[PDB]
Amino acid sequence: DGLDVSKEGTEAWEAAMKRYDERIDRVETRITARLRDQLGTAKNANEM
Amino acid sequence: EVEETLKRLQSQKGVQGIIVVNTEGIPIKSTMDNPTTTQYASLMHSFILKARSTVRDIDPQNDLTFLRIRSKKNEIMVAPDKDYFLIVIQNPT
Amino acid sequence: EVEETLKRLQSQKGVQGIIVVNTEGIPIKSTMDNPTTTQYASLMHSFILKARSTVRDIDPQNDLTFLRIRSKKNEIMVAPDKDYFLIVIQNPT
Amino acid sequence: LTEEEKQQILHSEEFLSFFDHSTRIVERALSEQINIKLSLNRQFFDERWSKHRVVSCLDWSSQYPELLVASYNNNEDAPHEPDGVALVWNMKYKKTTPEYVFHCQSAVMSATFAKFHPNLVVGGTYSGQIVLWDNRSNKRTPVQRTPLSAAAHTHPVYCVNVVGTQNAHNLISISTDGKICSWSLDMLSHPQDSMELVHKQSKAVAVTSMSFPVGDVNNFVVGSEEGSVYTACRHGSKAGISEMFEGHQGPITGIHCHAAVGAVDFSHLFVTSSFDWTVKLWTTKNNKPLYSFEDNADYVYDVMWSPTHPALFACVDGMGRLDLWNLNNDTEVPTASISVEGNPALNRVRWTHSGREIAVGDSEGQIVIYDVGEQIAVPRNDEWARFGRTLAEI
Numbered sequence: 001d002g003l004d005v006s007k008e009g010t011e012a013w014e015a016a017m018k019r020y021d022e023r024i025d026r027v028e029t030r031i032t033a034r035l036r037d038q039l040g041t042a043k044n045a046n047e048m
Numbered sequence: 049e050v051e052e053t054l055k056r057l058q059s060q061k062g063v064q065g066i067i068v069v070n071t072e073g074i075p076i077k078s079t080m081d082n083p084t085t086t087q088y089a090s091l092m093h094s095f096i097l098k099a100r101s102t103v104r105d106i107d108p109q110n111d112l113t114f115l116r117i118r119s120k121k122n123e124i125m126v127a128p129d130k131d132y133f134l135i136v137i138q139n140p141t
Numbered sequence: 142e143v144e145e146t147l148k149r150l151q152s153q154k155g156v157q158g159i160i161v162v163n164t165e166g167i168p169i170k171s172t173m174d175n176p177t178t179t180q181y182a183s184l185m186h187s188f189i190l191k192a193r194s195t196v197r198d199i200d201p202q203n204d205l206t207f208l209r210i211r212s213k214k215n216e217i218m219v220a221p222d223k224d225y226f227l228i229v230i231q232n233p234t
Numbered sequence: 235l236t237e238e239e240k241q242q243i244l245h246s247e248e249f250l251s252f253f254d255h256s257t258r259i260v261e262r263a264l265s266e267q268i269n270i271k272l273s274l275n276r277q278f279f280d281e282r283w284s285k286h287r288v289v290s291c292l293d294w295s296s297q298y299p300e301l302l303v304a305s306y307n308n309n310e311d312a313p314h315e316p317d318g319v320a321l322v323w324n325m326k327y328k329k330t331t332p333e334y335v336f337h338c339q340s341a342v343m344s345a346t347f348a349k350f351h352p353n354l355v356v357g358g359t360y361s362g363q364i365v366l367w368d369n370r371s372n373k374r375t376p377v378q379r380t381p382l383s384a385a386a387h388t389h390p391v392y393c394v395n396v397v398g399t400q401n402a403h404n405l406i407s408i409s410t411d412g413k414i415c416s417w418s419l420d421m422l423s424h425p426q427d428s429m430e431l432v433h434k435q436s437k438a439v440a441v442t443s444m445s446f447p448v449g450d451v452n453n454f455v456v457g458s459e460e461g462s463v464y465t466a467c468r469h470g471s472k473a474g475i476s477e478m479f480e481g482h483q484g485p486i487t488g489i490h491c492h493a494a495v496g497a498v499d500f501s502h503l504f505v506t507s508s509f510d511w512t513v514k515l516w517t518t519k520n521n522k523p524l525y526s527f528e529d530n531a532d533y534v535y536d537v538m539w540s541p542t543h544p545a546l547f548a549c550v551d552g553m554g555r556l557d558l559w560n561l562n563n564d565t566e567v568p569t570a571s572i573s574v575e576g577n578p579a580l581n582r583v584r585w586t587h588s589g590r591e592i593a594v595g596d597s598e599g600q601i602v603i604y605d606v607g608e609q610i611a612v613p614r615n616d617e618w619a620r621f622g623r624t625l626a627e628i
Contacts, residue, residue, distance in 0.1 A: 044529045046567045050244065053256055060260065076240045084199075091195050095188075102188050103212065106181060110214035113255065114262075118269075119196055119203045125263055129255045140269065207269070 062122065062139040069093065069133045076132070085135075092126055092135060157230040162186075165224060182228050189219055189226065271607025272558075272572045275591060276325075278302070279600035280332055283319040286311055289595035291357075292584035295347040299587050300325035301333075303355055305345040306599055318342035320357055320367065323601070336367045337374045344392050350403045350419050358391035364407055364422060380422045387413055393444040397451050406446075406468070408456065412439040414468070431456070431466065433475050439464065447491035447501045455504050455518065457486030463506050465518055479521065484509030488536040493585075494544035497618035505547055507537035513549055515561065525628075527559065535581045535595075542589030543613040545621050552579040556594055560610065562620040570610055574602055 001013040041047035050066075057066040067079040073090035096112065103110050117124045118140055125136040143161065150159055158172030166186030171178045189208060196203045210217045211233060218229030287306040295301040304321040318341035321332040338359055345357030355367040364387065366378040380386045391409035396419060398404050404416040404426075412431035431439045440459035447454060453467045453476075461484055465477040488507035492500045502518045511530040514523040532552030540546035545561040549568070554577040557568030574580065574594065582595025590611055592604045 050249075053253065056260060057256075060263070061266070066256075070240070072235075076244065088199055091198055095191055095195050098191065099188060099210070102184055103210075103215075105184065106177075107212070107214050110212045112210065112212055113259065114209075114211040116207065116209045117192065117196060117205065118207050119205060121200075121203060125259065127255060127259045129252050132252050132255075134256060134259065136263070138263070138266075141266065 057136065060136065060138060061141070063136050067135055069135055071131050071133075075135075080137075089133075089135060092124075093133065096126060096128060096133070154231060159227070159229055162226045162228065163224055166226070178228070182226070185217070185219060185228065186226055189221055193221070271605075271610060272556075272570050273605040273607075274602060275605035276328065276603035277600060278304070278321075278323040278332070278603065280321060280335075283316070283321060283332075283335060283337075284599035285315075287319065287599055288597050289581050289599060289601060290342065291344045291346070292582050292593050292595060292601070293346045294584060294587050294593075295352070296349060296587055297347075297352040301347070302584070302593060302601075303345045303347060303357075304332075304601060305342045305357055307341040307343055307360065309341060318359055320345050320355065322355060322369075325603075334369055335374065336376075338365050338376055340365075343390055344394050346394055346396070348405075348419055349396050349398075350400060354419075356394060356396065356405060356419075358387075358394040358407055358409070360390045362387040362389050362391055362409060364391065364394065364405070364417065366422065378422050380417070380425075385425050385428060387411070387415060389413075392442055395444070395446065397446055404451075406444075408441050408444055410440060410442060410459070412441040414466075416468075429473060431464075431474055433464070433478065439475065443486055443489040445490045445504065447504070448493060448495060449501065455489060455491060457489035457506055459485045461485055461508065463489065477518070477521075479523075481506065481523065482508035482510060482512045482514065484512065484533065487534065488538075488550075490538050490547075492544070493539035493541045494613075497544070497615075498622055500544055500621070505537050505539060507534040507549070509533050511551070513537050513547075513559075524625075525565065527565075532579075535579070536583045538583050538585050540589055540611070541585050541587055543611065544618055545613065545624075546611070548583040548585065548592055550580045550583050550594070554578050554580055556580060556583065556592075556604065558592075558606065558610065562617060562624055565624070570606070 001009050039048065054065045057063055065079045066077055067075050067085065068077040069075045069089040069092065071093065073086065073093045075085055075089055100112055103112065113127050115126045123138050123140050125138060127134040147159060147161060160168055160170035160172050160178055162168045162182060166183040168179055168182050192208065193205050196205045206220060206222055208219045213233055216229065216231045216233055219227045284306055287308055290305040290307045293303045302323045304323060306319045306321065309315060309317045316337040318338045320336040320338065320342050322334045324333040336355065340359040340361040340363065342357045343360045345355060348354040348356050353369050355369065357365050359365055361382065363382055364380040365376045368377040371377055382388055387407065387409040389409045389411035391407055394407040396403055396405040403419050405419050406414065406416050408414045413428055414431055415425045415428035418426055431441060433439055441456055442459045443457035445455055452469055453465060455463060455465050457463045462481045463479045463486060464475045466475050467473050486506055487509055489504065491504040494500065504516065504518065506514045506516065511528055511533040513527045513534055516524045530551065535550040535552065537547055537549050546558055549557050549559060553573065555571055555573040557571035560569035563569050578597040580594050580596055584593045592606060594602045594604060596602065
């Protein structure tokens with residue numbers, strides 16, 4: 001979508017971006033998994 | 049040009065400019081420590097002269113300009129023309 | 142081996158003559174005649190003993206392992222290590 | 235015969251044959267062929283002179299990169315035993331004993347090699363006297379000794395360094411009171427120049443470290459005991475402190491300008507080592523500490539730039555860990571980090587001028603010579619550009 005001004009066009013864009021956020025939450029899960037599996041060491045810097 | 053010769057010679061590996069030894073055993077050019085190079089050039093002159101005698105024994109028409117004294121540390125290139133005897137220290141590598 | 146050694150050392154350039162010398166000078170082997178081989182090799186042995194002294198002068202730990210003189214008429218070869226004294230008669234080129 | 239006729243015969247023009255000879259032999263002789271990670275490199279620990287007596291300073295001889303000056307200070311075991319001892323330890327051959335030993339009346343608190351004299355070691359002591367040691371002499375006693383007058387230093391001097399060209403030298407030294415003084419290396423009978431460092435009017439500087447930027451001898455950086463680093467001008471109309479830095483809330487325990495050259499300049503950079511485990515990658519041109527490496531419970535004691543790598547620098551600790559921080563490689567975790575055994579509070583680091591090997595001080599006197607991995611020590615030609623980009627990051 002672009003200069004498209006149909007509000008239903010905005011709704012289709014919202015579907016597209018909720019799919020976007022689906023990939024984004026996949027990313028969130030991945031980054032949090034790497035977080036937790038890399039945790040447990042200590043507080044300092046590269047640990048927490 | 050003597051300076052051109054010096055810059056050409058110093059470009060060689062392990063060579064410090066050009067040092068030339070006359071028939072008196074004293075280097076006409078100074079590039080290294082004087083006593084060591086003088087005694088070394090004197091022994092050089094002696095044994096190149098005995099080599100000249102050795103070759104003239106059976107080769108009365110040959111001339112000496114090339115000799116490769118190479119060791120496991122360095123090689124000395126000794127080249128006599130008629131009075132000027134170039135001595136060049138070069139790494140074997 | 143013996144014959145293969147001389148054959149391979151010779152035909153590499155069609156060398157005029159080489160004999161194997163494992164002793165200090167005075168070789169009884171011959172390649173073109175007895176005199177020009179034996180006396181010349183004895184002279185070479187005498188000369189290279191002096192050359193070894195010369196290389197030991199600058200530092201006694203130095204030893205000569207390879208020696209060539211390429212002159213206007215001949216190219217002389219010897220590679221002494223403990224008793225193995227080479228002889229090569231070959232054109233200057 | 236003598237060295238005059240040779241000049242004229244050289245000037246004679248029969249050299250065409252000789253020139254052709256040289257040309258032929260050189261061109262024919264041109265062709266050449268053949269005929270056929272952090273590691274404990276070494277230890278240096280005396281026993282007669284190194285019973286306790288913590289390390290204080292280290293240095294490598296520029297003329298003799300195989301020599302390292304130690305300076306063992308505190309005397310508490312035996313008052314009868316020598317108070318301050320300086321040890322010089324060689325690298326070419328391994329021995330259980332220092333190559334030479336020097337004993338000073340007071341406790342030596344810093345030391346270094348002289349540049350002009352390649353046979354001389356000069357150190358500052360706790361009393362305040364700059365002390366010589368001529369290795370020619372067979373007397374362990376100091377050869378020449380500065381007076382303890384108001385003109386000279388009267389407070390524990392902790393920073394000494396001789397700089398300049400081989401024909402223009404000045405042994406600089408700055409003591410805890412902050413009085414800078416330069417001496418001639420050969421004449422220490424009198425301070426040839428001195429001036430008391432002061433901040434904004436009526437504010438002395440409790441100086442405790444210095445470092446001259448590479449090349450420059452006129453302006454430098456000094457680290458106070460009050461956590462605030464300054465930049466001073468050794469000589470000029472503005473001679474003295476010219477900057478006030480916020481720095482860190484702990485006393486400065488080490489300072490060092492950059493130690494590399496060849497590409498885009500970085501001499502405006504210098505690292506300080508504070509008293510709360512806060513080493514500060516940071517430059518003269520700016521005023522805010524560029525970055526603030528922190529971790530640990532303990533706190534650093536010295537930091538030195540690598541003499542060859544324009545990013546790497548060492549970092550002491552009180553828990554005995556020495557860590558090399560390679561900024562280009564990473565900026566958050568020590569690129570290398572290992573602890574010497576027995577967890578003693580290390581107190582000094584001095585990279586070898588070669589840059590291929592590092593020394594470390596010790597709280598008990600066992601100087602440890604660490605070697606470093608080849609990939610972690612030598613930088614590349616691209617390394618300088620990467621460093622520039624990383625600095626440009628923030």
